[PDB]
Paper text:
We crystallized and solved 3D crystal structures for two catalytically active forms of Δ117Pro: one in its VPg-free form, the second in its VPg-bound state with fused VPg at the C-terminal part (Δ117Pro-E/A-VPg), and one catalytically defective Δ117Procm form with S159/A mutation. The expression of the Procm variant confirmed the importance of S159 for the catalytic activity of RGMoV Pro. First, in the absence of VPg, L87 shifted towards the VPg-binding pocket. Second, the α1 helix in the VPg-free structure is also slightly shifted towards the empty VPg binding site; although, the position of the catalytic triad H49, located on this helix, is minimally affected. These two conformational shifts are driven by the presence or absence of VPg, since they align well in the Δ117Procm and Δ117Pro cases, which do not contain VPg at all. However, in the Δ117Pro chain B, Δ117Procm, and Δ117Pro-E/A-VPg cases, D92 is directed towards H49, as would be expected in an active Pro. Surprisingly, conformational differences were observed between the Δ117Pro, Δ117Pro-E/A-VPg, and Δ117Procm states, with the only difference being the S159/A mutation. Different crystallization conditions could be at play, but it is very likely that these differences are actual representations of natural conformational oscillations in the Pro molecule.
Author numbering: 5 to 176, 183 to 195
The structure:
Amino acid sequence: SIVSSVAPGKEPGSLVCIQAKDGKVIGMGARVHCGPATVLVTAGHVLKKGMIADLYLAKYSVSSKEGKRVLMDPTWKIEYGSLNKEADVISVQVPAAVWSRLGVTAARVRKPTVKVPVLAYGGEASGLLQSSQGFATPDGNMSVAHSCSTRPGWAGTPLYAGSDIVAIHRRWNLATNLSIFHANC
């Protein structure tokens, strides 16, 4: 798996970091279309931390030439998924105002295909992102096997196939086949 630096602002427009209050990146996520609206999608064990501590959605701002972030409200409604279950995927009805302030566009969820090329993103700061290349294969249940290298703090990051998201990375590999749970939309 080839690992590469991603220049500030050149990551996909849907991607967001999830930070603790001291700025540490503890997970990733993305804005995706969900019926007539959009949702955050991330790992359930990442979102669970925001029940007892403050988490922030974070993304590099091209116009400000620095990172920006917005406090997460744990009472934002859950669209699908769960904080504690095996698939470890959850989606949240984040207000459009928050996505607007961070510059986050919505991506499309697509079904994975066999050995589809994929990119996964993560990093220690919103202008210090990196990507890892790999391939993804769905298992006929709710998961995808994939070959992207990841680091701790990449939990919840999408696997991108071209423009679209086909999976959610779980933990530092088996990702969740997002289209399975996205059918709740």
